[PDB]
């Protein structure tokens, strides 16, 4: 099959995966059960990880692999509906290709219309770096609380956010920091230490001659019989090192985990037995079990979080949210430009192209209006999950935002009685909305150009 009929047998399948994660967007999402071909069971309410690993036939969903590995790593916040957001521009184009419109006319129509709404974002853009450290830190507390974490952390994010913000301030001028967690405890019982988490065990180290250091020793090569065995051990105690780390007393340390110990202690790895010296020893406060607790008295570049939860799935969901939280906060402090998300930013760009559609007119008149209707379907996803009428609520909000130029009032993702995102302190990165709404046109460039699909043999 070739031609327009072949394009409908593939591209139209994107509406199937869009309705799968449609109900899972935002805090109102529902837990969906997924089964991998290998037999593993994955249950989560985040649609970004659902479509990340899946077994499908049509290649129209295979283009989402580069989208999932990007938005989750670059931002992570609001990435649950990135496929629905990307299909929103496609669903409007599916009605245009039925009219006989050329794909480039559709691609250039959505590309220029998305650039006109950037000027509207600059008018409503704010800066969180211009305020003091009190307001800048408080904005990081409610940024991921009302948006990012959708599981159990709605009320309790104050514990996970405060531990995440303090980790950012310590290293402020995450790839060099290893973070993990063990199943147990609760949300508010999580502990924070300066160092790297060491799961391997051997007890208490007393203060040495130096202030706040153990003079830690790390030897990769094992001692190499009984005469040299006890002789090399006494050489470790010459510098006052009670704890020794060797591959073959802490033993069996991983390759990547061993380097994080030297990074936090600012030490060196001693391959031989003749290179042991006080200059090659790392600096660590003490090592004890409270899993050994590695503490650092002086401020270092390694600060990790230990996730605790009552369920084994909470540890996986809370830790993954922290990986995305470190990415959002990284872009907020680096990029001073910020916007108010949570339904306000998507509707903001819809009214900009709506007013510019009547100015250009021409053949792009209905093309610009379709780009406005494509952005209007994004809040319709959160409207059904919150119980609000998608057509009725937006028709009222577009009328209120017509008289008042402030676009912050809009659909609330939390479902509370406050429709103002500025009142709820919902702040999203400006580069985040750029990598979601604007970058989605780049993904549509591959979909709109689909014409004939070549299927080879075995």
């Amino acid at each position: 099959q070739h031609g327009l009929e072949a394009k409908k047998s593939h591209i139209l399948a994107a509406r199937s995966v869009a309705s799968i994660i449609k109900t899972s967007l935002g805090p109102r999402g529902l837990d969906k059960i997924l089964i991998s071909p290998d037999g593993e069971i994955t249950i989560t309410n985040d649609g970004a990880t659902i479509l990340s690993q899946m077994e499908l036939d049509n290649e129209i969903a295979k283009l989402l692999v580069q989208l999932s590995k990007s938005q989750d790593d670059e931002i992570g916040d609001g990435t649950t509906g990135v496929v629905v957001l990307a299909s929103a521009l496609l669903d409007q184009a599916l009605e245009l290709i039925q009219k006989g419109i050329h794909p480039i006319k559709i691609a250039n129509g959505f590309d220029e219309a998305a650039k006109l709404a950037i000027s509207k974002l600059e008018e409503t853009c704010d800066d969180i770096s211009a305020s003091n450290d009190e307001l800048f830190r408080d904005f990081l507390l409610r940024a991921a609380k009302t948006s990012l974490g959708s599981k159990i952390v709605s009320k309790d994010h104050d514990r996970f956010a405060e531990m995440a913000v303090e980790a950012v301030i310590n290293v402020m001028d995450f790839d060099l920091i290893k973070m993990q967690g063990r199943v147990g405890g609760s949300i508010s019982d999580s502990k924070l230490i300066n160092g790297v988490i060491l799961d391997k065990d051997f007890k208490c180290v007393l203060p040495k001659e130096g202030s706040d250091g153990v003079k830690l020793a790390i030897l990769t090569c094992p001692f190499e019989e009984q005469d040299k065995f006890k002789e090399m051990i006494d050489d470790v105690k010459k510098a006052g090192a009670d704890v020794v780390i060797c591959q073959w007393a802490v033993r069996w340390v991983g390759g990547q985990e061993l380097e994080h110990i030297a990074i936090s202690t600012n030490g060196r790895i001693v391959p031989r037995f003749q290179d042991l010296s006080k200059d090659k020893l790392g600096t660590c406060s003490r090592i004890y079990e409270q899993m050994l607790i590695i503490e650092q008295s002086k401020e270092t570049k390694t600060v990790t979080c230990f996730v605790r939860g009552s369920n084994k799935m909470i540890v996986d969901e809370a830790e993954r949210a922290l990986h995305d939280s470190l990415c959002v906060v990284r872009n907020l402090v680096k990029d001073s430009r910020v916007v108010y998300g949570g339904g306000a930013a998507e509707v903001t760009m819809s009214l900009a192209v709506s007013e510019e559609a009547d100015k250009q007119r021409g053949i792009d008149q209905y093309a610009f209006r379709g780009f406005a209707q494509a952005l209007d379907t994004i809040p319709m996803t959160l409207a059904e999950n919150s119980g609000l009428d998608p057509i009725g609520t937006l028709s009222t909000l577009k009328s209120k935002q017509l008289k008042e130029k402030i676009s912050n009032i809009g659909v609330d993702c939390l479902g509370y009685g406050s429709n103002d995102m500025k009142e709820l302190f919902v702040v999203d990165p400006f580069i985040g909305k750029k990598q979601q709404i604007l970058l989605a046109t780049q993904l549509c460039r591959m979909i709109l150009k689909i014409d004939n699909v070549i299927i080879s043999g075995k």
Partner: protein, 482 residues
């Protein structure tokens, strides 16, 4: 929709009059007869992961309650039936429907607090109710005829704890042969083992020591080969310096070192897997020793009576002289292991629960009473909440009204007349009203002889009711096929 069909199989697994469900394994062609669906849902395979979640959450209910762990699963099964009706008739989004019960869950949790009665100071009512515990919660299975017989085992065991929360110090012994009415209570530490034929039968003031280890011509090589037999002589020589006449090993012992222990007058104990090594070290004051040189490190055990006695068919061990009341022993006797295997779970339903009940002094009337009171208190929030969730608030009490129908259907009596008389008596302001399956009527718990300790009702009736609402938040939607 994978967990909907689960409630049909476990419907008969609740209530004291409920019927057991036979299990059949494809491997070895074994079988098991049990009431609670903890092992039933675990052994039977499940093709839907939605039903696997109900199995994983039931493992916590085993140690917390253990009696009728399916009571949490039958609630979610009834809620999904009413949730599908709200999706069609009322056309409400499932998130609002699920939160409709979550918002009404606050009234259900607060209903247990208002109905909670605080008991403190004098234990006269605490010790007297320990005997009456065995008449209700202990055995819901075919063993209900042994409630009066097993009452002496559970009553004297809790009083011996004296605040002991450690379950690993309690040993369960199953005597082969005899009858269920022949189970006797013995004072001491009972363990099922044996001795050797030539070993000394009794030794006064014996010590307990365990081990984590495992014990030119053709005849010209005998000079080099005799060194292997001398290696065991250095091990027994250092152990003999301890002055211990009773040796214990985790793994098996060869016949060669076995007779070497009899030459020095040292008993040997083997066939200890997990509970044999750990509990014996705690009761007699022992510790795992990897040294076997100087009697200094770790700890050495001691026992007054090491003599073995014959209990029932196979002779078991009787250890006396323990100076600490932390450890308890409950001995049972039965002809076949069919009723004996499920008799252990009866101890986990009450005796093992009472260890953690010392902190909770709150009590509430159970046996169908507490579930109906929460349905009466939630009805007051129907007009206050209003909204679209008001339909879920009224439907929340419908699931609680179907709980007494489980005990009525398992008893054979009609569930329409019993629940109709049960609801009308409770709505009149009587909290003691409950269902009577013996006479097929409605009577109070005190009139029917149903009484339990005030600490027990919080960790069983109130705990499972509170932990259920924690487990009712699991979302069930259309899943992805493999």
């Amino acid at each position: 929709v994978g967990a909907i069909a689960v409630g049909d199989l476990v419907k008969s697994t609740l209530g004291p009059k409920g019927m057991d469900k036979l299990l059949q394994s494809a491997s070895s062609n074994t079988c098991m007869v049990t009431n609670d669906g903890a092992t039933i849902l675990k052994s039977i395979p499940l093709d839907n992961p939605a039903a696997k979640v109900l199995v994983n959450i039931s493992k916590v209910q085993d140690d917390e309650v253990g009696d009728g762990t399916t009571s949490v699963t039958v609630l979610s099964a009834e809620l999904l039936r009413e949730a599908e009706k709200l999706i069609d008739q009322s056309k409400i989004h499932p998130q609002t429907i699920i939160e409709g019960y979550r918002l009404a869950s606050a009234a259900a949790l607060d209903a247990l607090t208002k109905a909670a009665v605080d008991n403190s100071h004098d234990k006269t009512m605490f010790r007297e109710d320990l005997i009456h515990i065995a008449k209700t919660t202990l055995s819901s299975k075919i063993l209900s005829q042994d409630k009066d017989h097993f009452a002496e085992l559970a009553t004297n065991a809790i009083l011996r704890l004296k605040g002991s929360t450690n379950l690993e110090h309690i040993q369960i012994i199953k005597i082969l042969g005899g009858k269920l009415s022949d189970s006797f209570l013995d004072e001491g530490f009972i363990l099922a083992k044996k001795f050797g034929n030539n070993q000394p039968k009794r030794i006064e003031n014996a010590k307990i020591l365990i081990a984590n280890t495992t014990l030119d011509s053709t005849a010209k090589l005998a000079q080099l080969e005799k060194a292997e037999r001398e290696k065991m002589k250095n091990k027994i020589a250092k152990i003999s310096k301890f002055g211990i006449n009773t040796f214990i090993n985790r793994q098996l012992i060869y016949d060669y070192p076995e007779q070497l222990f009899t030459d020095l007058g040292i008993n040997s104990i083997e066939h200890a897997d997990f509970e044999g090594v750990e509990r014996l070290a705690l009761v007699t004051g022992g510790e795992v020793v990897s040294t076997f040189d100087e009697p200094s490190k770790c700890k050495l055990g001691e026992c007054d009576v090491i003599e073995e006695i014959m209990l029932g068919e196979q002779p078991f061990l009787k250890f006396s002289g323990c100076k600490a009341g932390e450890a308890c022993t409950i001995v049972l006797r039965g002809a076949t292991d069919q009723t004996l295997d499920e008799a252990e779970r009866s101890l986990h339903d009450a005796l093992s629960v009472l260890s953690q009940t010392t902190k909770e002094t709150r009590t509430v009337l159970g046996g169908g009473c507490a579930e109906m009171v929460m349905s009466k208190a939630v009805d007051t929030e129907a007009q206050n909440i209003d909204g679209k969730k008001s339909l879920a608030v009224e439907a929340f009490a419908r699931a609680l009204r179907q709980l007494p129908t489980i005990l009525a259907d398992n008893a054979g009596f009609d569930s329409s007349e019993l629940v109709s008389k049960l609801r009308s008596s409770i709505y009149n302001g009587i909290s003691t009203s409950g269902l009577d399956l013996n006479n097929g009527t409605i009577a109070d718990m005190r009139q029917l002889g149903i009484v339990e300790s005030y600490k027990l009702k919080r960790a069983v009736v109130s705990s499972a009711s509170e932990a259920a609402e924690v487990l009712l938040r699991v979302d069930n939607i259309i899943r992805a096929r493999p």
